[PDB]
Amino acid sequence: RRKR
Amino acid sequence: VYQEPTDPKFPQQWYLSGVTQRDLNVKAAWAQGYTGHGIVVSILDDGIEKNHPDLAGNYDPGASFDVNDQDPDPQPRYTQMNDNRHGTRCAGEVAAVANNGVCGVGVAYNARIGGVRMLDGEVTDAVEARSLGLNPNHIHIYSASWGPEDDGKTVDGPARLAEEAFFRGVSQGRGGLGSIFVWASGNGGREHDSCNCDGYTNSIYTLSISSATQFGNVPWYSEACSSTLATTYSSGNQNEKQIVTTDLRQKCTESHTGTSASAPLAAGIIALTLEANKNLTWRDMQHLVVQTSKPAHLNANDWATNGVGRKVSHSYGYGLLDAGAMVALAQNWTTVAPQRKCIIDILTEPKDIGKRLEVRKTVTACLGEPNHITRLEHAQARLTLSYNRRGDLAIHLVSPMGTRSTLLAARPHDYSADGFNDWAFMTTHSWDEDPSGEWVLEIENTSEANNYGTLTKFTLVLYGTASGSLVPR
Ligand SMILES: [Ca+2]
Ligand SMILES: [Ca+2]
Ligand SMILES: [Ca+2]
Ligand SMILES: [Cl-]
Ligand code: NA
Ligand code: NA
Ligand code: NA
């Protein structure tokens, strides 16, 4: 869902 | 007489100062006496090495939490691949200790620095909300170098809890002055991604920050969009220098890169600015960024002058941050008037898109009402539409003062047939313009394919005030  | 830092890697921090003028003008703010004392910044990321020799002196447990494991200690999880180094690198950009013989210095090298360990695990809506809403009467500034996937086909933003955290932060945070949320605009340049398809950067409550290379060019990873507000230096090609910061395992790195490095530098500059005037509201801070950022020598083919004489680019917003100008302008800043919101439902019937659709509407911007706006801040075109191949769409919005904002450029990889469901495309490019008059929305098929769809809702949402304008630039 979320990435660096 | 101000003495600059003696840290061993400070001479390699080309973006902080120099004779050359390709810098963020941070030494000028230091010489005015602003180094971040009393300001609290939190890095929302994969953890912070709180015992790092260049962070320990500034570390603040009150600015820290571990949402992934539900404990107070944001220490990164150590692995052979050093996967969880990202947050420590970001923290050193903000607040690495100065004059201690270790690595380089943070922009706000006397600020207090914390970290929220929240990326090392499944990043749910609840995880984001608990991180964005952490200790909002203690933390002043939140820095986020993360977001939805940069594959150039995702449209995604804060879900309900995270959006509630944004509104709670800007409304009640920092004693009612509003939490400052700084966002990295994205690494999707190679995928032709648009940072307006990212609801975090596209939010009016975040300062979305893009990147420039050392030689003043648009980096390969950069995403262009109208919601970006300003720019800080970051990495580029292999002849251009990179960002110097604290690394995992108590090391120093000179190779921090990407959009991830730009937001922390902006957060540090905002920390210096808050020290110069602690009474600044979340909207004050965006006004300061708009007025003081510098286009000069940033190369782009889309520089345009808006209705109030300011140069604006979809790659850079209003240009490079200028710390010295920020802290100078902050000191005697007059608080802006309360924010007004004027909602204009544009359509009287759905409209087939076809090859090209243009929707023109003349608005009064709530003339005669308490939410009358003559001085725009953010504007949104909230669009609901169906289309068979989303990434073939290009969407533009023209303000009454003639400023053409690209709300959406073609995204070759976005094959989705799901269209846009009240997606609030945002532009910063008409800031301080009078929004009364004719607005124009353009939707076009950029491909030769026989695409098809319908625009069923277009709400123009204007934010701003009715007082306090400057003579145009
Ligand atoms: Ca922990
Ligand atoms: Ca140091
Ligand atoms: Ca993106
Ligand atoms: Cl609102
Ligand atoms: Na408030
Ligand atoms: Na934003
Ligand atoms: Na007008």
Side-chain angles (χ1 to χ4, degrees):
Chain A
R1 194 170 171 273
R2 304 285 182 251
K3 299 274 201 287
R4 290 168 182 80
Chain B
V1 294
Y2 171 76
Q3 297 298 112
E4 74 181 14
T6 57
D7 305 61
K9 304 302 184 197
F10 175 67
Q12 296 166 246
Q13 302 187 273
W14 56 274
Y15 43 94
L16 295 182
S17 61
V19 289
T20 78
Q21 167 114 332
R22 311 189 304 195
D23 59 60
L24 299 165
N25 198 28
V26 170
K27 185 180 169 297
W30 295 341
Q32 290 178 244
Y34 303 110
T35 56
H37 178 78
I39 309 303
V40 176
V41 182
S42 182
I43 307 306
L44 307 189
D45 211 283
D46 57 12
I48 184 183
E49 193 166 72
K50 65 188 182 295
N51 60 335
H52 192 292
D54 228 20
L55 303 175
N58 286 332
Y59 178 71
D60 180 4
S64 306
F65 202 77
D66 181 342
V67 175
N68 294 132
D69 281 340
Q70 324 265 29
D71 68 66
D73 180 357
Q75 194 74 19
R77 177 175 60 90
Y78 292 93
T79 65
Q80 279 191 302
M81 281 176 74
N82 294 319
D83 309 80
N84 300 298
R85 69 182 190 183
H86 187 258
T88 294
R89 293 184 168 199
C90 292
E93 296 181 75
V94 180
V97 174
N99 296 306
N100 68 337
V102 176
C103 199
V105 308
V107 168
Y109 55 69
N110 281 323
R112 282 188 285 176
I113 187 68
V116 179
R117 180 165 178 262
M118 42 84 60
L119 294 178
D120 191 10
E122 197 199 343
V123 182
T124 61
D125 181 42
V127 161
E128 300 179 4
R130 287 194 288 270
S131 305
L132 293 164
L134 178 70
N135 209 3
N137 288 319
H138 180 71
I139 298 170
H140 299 120
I141 300 158
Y142 303 79
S143 188
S145 292
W146 53 266
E149 185 167 1
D150 292 328
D151 54 6
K153 54 178 182 179
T154 300
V155 181
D156 199 7
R160 179 171 173 173
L161 295 163
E163 176 56 27
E164 284 163 352
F166 279 136
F167 210 107
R168 294 174 73 84
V170 302
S171 298
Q172 289 88 38
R174 250 196 335 124
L177 300 176
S179 303
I180 306 301
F181 301 104
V182 186
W183 225 273
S185 66
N187 275 329
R190 170 179 42 155
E191 311 303 325
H192 302 278
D193 202 7
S194 163
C195 37
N196 280 359
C197 293
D198 171 342
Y200 300 86
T201 55
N202 199 49
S203 175
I204 76 174
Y205 307 123
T206 68
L207 298 99
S208 183
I209 306 302
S210 287
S211 301
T213 74
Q214 183 182 24
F215 303 160
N217 286 316
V218 177
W220 65 270
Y221 50 84
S222 174
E223 301 183 36
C225 65
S226 58
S227 59
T228 293
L229 194 66
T231 297
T232 66
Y233 285 115
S234 186
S235 65
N237 65 38
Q238 296 195 41
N239 308 94
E240 297 172 301
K241 294 296 183 178
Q242 299 184 337
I243 304 305
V244 176
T245 188
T246 50
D247 204 0
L248 199 64
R249 303 176 189 283
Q250 314 197 1
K251 286 135 80 176
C252 181
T253 184
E254 297 80 36
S255 48
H256 187 33
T257 66
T259 196
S260 292
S262 280
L265 292 174
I269 291 177
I270 290 167
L272 305 186
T273 305
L274 249 204
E275 192 193 354
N277 180 346
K278 294 211 68 188
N279 298 331
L280 291 170
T281 71
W282 70 276
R283 281 169 53 241
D284 284 333
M285 192 61 69
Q286 295 195 30
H287 281 276
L288 289 175
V289 167
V290 169
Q291 293 194 14
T292 61
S293 295
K294 299 299 198 298
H297 303 143
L298 294 180
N299 301 310
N301 72 351
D302 77 324
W303 279 115
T305 301
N306 70 5
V308 296
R310 296 201 182 99
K311 295 252 196 70
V312 68
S313 164
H314 296 81
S315 288
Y316 303 120
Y318 287 93
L320 274 175
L321 293 182
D322 176 348
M326 286 281 283
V327 299
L329 188 60
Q331 290 170 57
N332 273 117
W333 184 259
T334 296
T335 312
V336 293
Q339 182 215 61
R340 309 176 174 201
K341 177 184 188 180
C342 181
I343 300 165
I344 305 152
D345 223 16
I346 301 286
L347 299 192
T348 56
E349 59 168 19
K351 305 273 178 159
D352 277 343
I353 292 167
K355 175 57 173 184
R356 179 166 192 281
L357 172 71
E358 175 165 320
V359 178
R360 295 170 177 175
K361 176 73 164 139
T362 293
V363 310
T364 65
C366 292
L367 187 65
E369 312 168 351
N371 53 336
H372 182 220
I373 294 167
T374 64
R375 211 183 147 203
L376 196 63
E377 291 168 0
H378 319 83
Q380 292 164 331
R382 303 194 183 184
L383 303 185
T384 305
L385 63 86
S386 50
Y387 208 65
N388 63 300
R389 181 172 179 102
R390 198 165 51 191
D392 285 355
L393 292 172
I395 307 177
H396 296 84
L397 180 69
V398 191
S399 76
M401 296 295 289
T403 303
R404 190 163 194 259
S405 293
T406 304
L407 300 184
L408 179 64
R411 291 206 299 169
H413 301 298
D414 184 7
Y415 59 79
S416 166
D418 295 334
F420 289 102
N421 180 19
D422 193 41
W423 186 259
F425 297 94
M426 191 269 280
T427 180
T428 61
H429 291 205
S430 285
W431 200 278
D432 282 325
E433 294 179 4
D434 191 328
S436 169
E438 185 197 22
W439 288 81
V440 184
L441 185 74
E442 302 156 350
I443 304 177
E444 54 197 346
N445 177 18
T446 64
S447 69
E448 306 293 354
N450 295 313
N451 295 332
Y452 54 94
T454 310
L455 175 69
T456 62
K457 191 189 291 173
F458 168 21
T459 318
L460 182 68
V461 182
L462 313 170
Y463 294 96
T465 63
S467 67
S469 287
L470 284 59
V471 174
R473 180 164 299 168

